[PDB]
Design an enzyme around this catalytic site. Structure first.
Site, PDB file in Angstrom:
ATOM      1  N   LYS B  69      43.843  37.171  45.868  1.00 20.04           N
ATOM      2  CA  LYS B  69      44.453  38.482  46.072  1.00 20.04           C
ATOM      3  C   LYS B  69      45.100  38.593  47.451  1.00 20.04           C
ATOM      4  CE  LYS B  69      41.470  41.697  45.895  1.00 20.04           C
ATOM      5  NZ  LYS B  69      41.179  41.541  47.349  1.00 20.04           N
ATOM      6  N   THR B  71      46.059  36.057  49.352  1.00 14.24           N
ATOM      7  CA  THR B  71      47.143  35.080  49.400  1.00 14.24           C
ATOM      8  C   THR B  71      48.429  35.643  48.805  1.00 14.24           C
ATOM      9  OG1 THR B  71      45.491  33.321  49.218  1.00 14.24           O
ATOM     10  CG2 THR B  71      47.785  32.725  48.810  1.00 14.24           C
ATOM     11  N   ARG B  92      42.785  43.577  56.118  1.00 20.11           N
ATOM     12  CA  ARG B  92      41.511  43.845  56.765  1.00 20.11           C
ATOM     13  C   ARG B  92      41.118  42.713  57.708  1.00 20.11           C
ATOM     14  NH1 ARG B  92      37.853  44.609  51.624  1.00 20.11           N
ATOM     15  NH2 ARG B  92      39.368  43.039  50.915  1.00 20.11           N
ATOM     16  N   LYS B 103      30.960  29.178  55.057  1.00 20.04           N
ATOM     17  CA  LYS B 103      32.127  28.793  55.826  1.00 20.04           C
ATOM     18  C   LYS B 103      32.773  29.995  56.510  1.00 20.04           C
ATOM     19  CE  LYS B 103      35.673  30.492  53.313  1.00 20.04           C
ATOM     20  NZ  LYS B 103      35.310  31.501  54.356  1.00 20.04           N
ATOM     21  N   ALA B 271      33.577  47.274  49.786  1.00 20.07           N
ATOM     22  CA  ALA B 271      34.333  47.822  48.669  1.00 20.07           C
ATOM     23  C   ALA B 271      33.446  48.439  47.596  1.00 20.07           C
ATOM     24  CB  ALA B 271      35.221  46.737  48.050  1.00 20.07           C
ATOM     25  N   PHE B 299      37.929  43.710  45.804  1.00 15.17           N
ATOM     26  CA  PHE B 299      37.490  43.604  44.416  1.00 15.17           C
ATOM     27  C   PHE B 299      38.633  43.892  43.449  1.00 15.17           C
ATOM     28  CE2 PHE B 299      32.968  44.856  45.888  1.00 15.17           C
ATOM     29  CZ  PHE B 299      32.772  43.570  46.349  1.00 15.17           C
ATOM     30  N   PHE B 380      48.856  27.725  38.280  1.00 16.91           N
ATOM     31  CA  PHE B 380      48.213  26.444  38.519  1.00 16.91           C
ATOM     32  C   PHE B 380      48.958  25.336  37.790  1.00 16.91           C
ATOM     33  CE2 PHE B 380      44.199  27.192  40.759  1.00 16.91           C
ATOM     34  CZ  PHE B 380      44.152  28.573  40.747  1.00 16.91           C
ATOM     35  N   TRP B 408      50.865  29.989  47.323  1.00 18.31           N
ATOM     36  CA  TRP B 408      49.832  29.166  47.941  1.00 18.31           C
ATOM     37  C   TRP B 408      50.384  27.817  48.391  1.00 18.31           C
ATOM     38  CZ3 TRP B 408      47.504  24.478  46.523  1.00 18.31           C
ATOM     39  CH2 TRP B 408      46.357  24.143  47.253  1.00 18.31           C
TER      40      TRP B 408
END
Lengths: 556, 555
Positions: B69, B71, B92, B103, B271, B299, B380, B408
């Protein structure tokens, strides 16, 4: 009469890029935080040649209830040396933000000897305090996580010494019990919070010569003991690498300026009782590397701050002060002679002679124990008579130390020319056979005895049973080779805050000893220490306000 | 290549040059290095706005694997810049705590990132520290008042305010403090949240200016007195100092994308127990400095978009001109019964079983809120042409185009198809924006409107304590506020296993709390973790610093 905030608002501070130019710093050597603050890349020490600047240490006599004017003198002398055409940097500490919301906050200095911007310095500044607190609390989170997951290090929960921190005066967090609730909510144990400036991270932050030594010092932090009685370190938890990353930018000294444009570096701010009470080594080294003269200071009197500056900081940094400024006032010396806080404005040559041994003892410690050239700076008040100023001068001439009058609070750098020129005379001529008070090979009790007898003037040191047990445990674990940091009252050379002047027939009562392996010294307690102060009945926060344009009122 | 290699190989412009793109002078920004800056919020008062359009990026219900989302928001913003538009991406700021557990990650992903990634993951400009300091000062003076006099007659067992820390520390979830001597406070139970969960953060993000921030902080209910009446931060004379702590933090932070598009990062509440959007100040600043603003909500569209529209847009007085709904073929096949390991294989039957989820979000945006929408499919390599044609066919029946996104791997060039459809939806100007409910409705009526219209439930059930808490809120006068439903994000229902588009279900409400500072009522359908925990092997153990101060192991 102008208030300190009015003076800071009427002064015209230069762009910090121009302040950095005075000390030969390029744009690629600094990172701006607005146009009046900057952090200096510590790697400049590797790609530039040092100027081998001189180190000037500012101290004072034992604190009095309404004086404590060490910082005003340090800034005034720095501005004075700039007037004389010298390349000078003032190195000072960053204050804690917490107390600003309890008792009213104040300027870095006072009058016309201030550091600007005043509002940012009292608050978030460049974020150093937040980074120290985050590193302190990350280590605590990783410590409790290890015990919760496996406790393969065999940590004993009742022997965990590490405490969390917050940059607030919150008595509610002094003694807590956490880890309550479900089995997934941790391991129940007693715990507590200190104020962030009291954390051991702050002391190790200020006693690291570089980023590699910082990461090593953080790893040596002892956070707990195992069931076999052996120390458990932050390195055992694989936490010091993450702590050093949190502190990567914070370790860069913060560049600001005085009211007269003199470069000033603010970095670090540990306690002066449970720690050494000095600014960071990186800031002092960076100043000596970028300037010809560095004016720094140490908290409290010369019996605590100067002793720890010389026997702890200078040892770990490999530096030596070239001259020492001892600040005192006529009102403070008459306070040590029996005069109450309300009768100080009246002339009293008898009480001045009874309180003068306090100043004389600090002169003998600096000149005869540490063998450093010294000069007495008297912050002159309008009601100080010529007979009072002549008596202090005569008694100090007997010890071979001049008395220079200081008027930096009302006149700025012009009020410190007399002190600055005497300092330049002490640096060029006059011998310096700097000696430490003790040696590392001595045991903890021998080092404590050397400080109490030479510096404090005591006959000896007594220990409680808990103190003898704790000290012996430190010796078995191998911490007897480190310096000692004595946590006693600052209002007296003794451990009794009522023995003013120069006490003689007394002894030091030691009740607790703990290890700060990150900073590299043993904390020895001669009393009870408040590592988390409390809010008063009417906190200063209730007067703080913000207008529709984002202007803060009520901070001072 | 990994996201760090892309961020490390990019040449970011000096932030003063980015500020020139949006007509900002040197005196309008405060530099934090040469790649970060804070924008003076007072610019909104001495300059005229460009009246920019608002583009909201949302998505279908999250899946345990794909999450693109953010990206898409960055890629579309870069795409509009390619087309010659003056665009700002408003997003945000993430929490620093989780960086040391799992990570640390990129602001986005692939070639749709925001730089500098290291600073954003760590201290950034210090906003999170300022949020925590204000939260903990109010807690300190709350306990101090009870300790000194308790003239407000606060009941310690009814203190709702919790302290915070920006760390994943499960040890601080449930504590007892005030122990020791009589000078060490008043003994009581307490707890810590992660800083982004604090109510200060939600009010921080729902304030149109510094005056509204100070007023909202004053309305914060921290406890109840023995007479059952609320006690506020204003009663403690705390909101003035809290607003001062947040004076600089309220200034939006200016950064940039990999392609030089201006980007504003500000705020980051939850959220579920909050609205999950960036600050109003950042969105208003974007609309004031640019002609187009791309923002997002956390979300799926059942939570973030619902709270973006029914809470944020209401309090800010704005309305989105277009909505981007992000989805993938793998996520739709996950809603059809395919396991997480069989997603790379073609399955047209399961794709038709999971598509009703995407169709449900389209109906909510276009028929309930009446906002033009466009579906952006993050394509994809193994997505077949038959799978992409089926998703297109089912969405054309609802009157919504399907644009393919490849931001992406290709950056702004991969979002031109999405950006052009957004501009096409904008160039018509037809605004029939409607809220889901009205303020005059009661709390139970507002929850029923959300569950039936948005979630698809038959109704809402309440426990007795929930009815007791809601009735108490009505008596105190909080029934006129919006509602923030805290439920699972993995399903339109409150059951995380009901994937696709559930029909015969009901919502079970168990607790209701008041966030009077932010201005909404929090309604939980379950237990919510406001303080996450560290794993067995924290990522902090891999973080290191070299001899020159270079950080390794963050990502």
């Amino acid at each position: 009469f102008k208030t300190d905030i009015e003076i800071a608002q009427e002064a015209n501070p230069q762009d910090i890029r121009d302040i950095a130019k005075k000390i030969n710093l390029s744009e690629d050597d600094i990172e701006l935080y607005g146009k009046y603050k900057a952090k200096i890349d510590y790697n400049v020490l590797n790609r530039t040649k040092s100027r081998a600047g001189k180190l000037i240490l500012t101290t004072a006599i034992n604190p009095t209830p309404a004086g404590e004017g060490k910082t005003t003198t340090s800034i005034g002398v720095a501005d004075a040396l700039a007037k004389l055409g010298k390349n000078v940097i003032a190195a000072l500490r960053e204050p804690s933000m917490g107390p600003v919301f309890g008792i009213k906050g104040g300027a870095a200095g006072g009058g016309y000897a201030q550091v600007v911007p005043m509002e940012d310095i009292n608050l978030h500044f460049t974020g150093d305090m937040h980074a120290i607190g985050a590193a302190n609390n990350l280590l605590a989170a990783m410590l409790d996580n290890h015990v919760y997951q496996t406790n393969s290090l065999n940590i004993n929960p009742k022997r965990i010494t590490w405490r969390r921190c917050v940059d607030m005066n919150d008595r509610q967090l002094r003694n807590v019990v956490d880890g309550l609730g479900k089995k997934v909510d941790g391991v129940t144990r007693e715990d507590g919070f200190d104020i962030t400036v009291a954390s051991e991270v702050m002391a190790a932050f200020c006693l690291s010569n570089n980023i590699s030594e910082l990461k090593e010092n953080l790893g040596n932090i002892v956070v707990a003991y195992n069931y076999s009685g052996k120390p458990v370190t932050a390195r055992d938890l694989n936490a010091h690498g993450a702590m050093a990353a949190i502190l990567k930018d914070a370790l860069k000294p913060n560049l600001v300026q005085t009211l007269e444009g003199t470069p000033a570096i603010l970095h670090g701010g540990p306690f002066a009782n449970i720690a050494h009470g000095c600014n960071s080594i990186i800031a002092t080294k960076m100043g000596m590397h970028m300037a010809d003269y560095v004016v720094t200071e140490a908290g409290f009197g010369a019996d605590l701050g100067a002793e720890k500056f010389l026997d702890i900081k200078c040892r770990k940094a490999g530096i030596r002060p070239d001259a020492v400024i001892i600040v005192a006032t006529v009102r403070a010396l008459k306070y040590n002679g029996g005069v109450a806080k309300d009768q100080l404005n009246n002339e009293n040559l008898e009480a001045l002679e009874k309180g003068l041994p306090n100043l004389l003892k600090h002169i003998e410690n600096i000149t005869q124990v540490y063998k450093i050239p010294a000069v007495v700076a008297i912050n002159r008040f309008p009601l100080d008579t010529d007979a009072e100023l002549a008596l202090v001068r005569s008694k100090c001439e007997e010890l071979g130390v001049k008395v220079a009058l200081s008027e930096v609070w009302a006149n700025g750098g012009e009020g410190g020319i007399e002190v600055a020129n005497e300092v330049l005379k002490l640096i060029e001529e006059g011998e310096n056979n700097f000696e430490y008070c003790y040696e590392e090979d001595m045991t903890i009790k021998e080092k404590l005895n050397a400080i109490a007898t030479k510096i404090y003037g005591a006959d000896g040191v007594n220990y409680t049973k808990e103190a003898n047990k704790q000290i012996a445990e430190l010796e078995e674990l191998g911490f007897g080779n480190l310096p000692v940091c004595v946590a006693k009252t600052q209002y007296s050379l003794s451990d009794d805050q009522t023995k003013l002047g120069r006490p003689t027939g007394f002894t030091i009562e030691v009740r607790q000893a703990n290890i700060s392996a990150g900073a590299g010294f043993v904390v020895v307690m001669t009393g009870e220490i408040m590592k988390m102060p409390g809010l008063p009945k009417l906190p200063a926060a209730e007067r703080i306000d913000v207008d529709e344009n984002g202007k803060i009122s009520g901070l001072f």
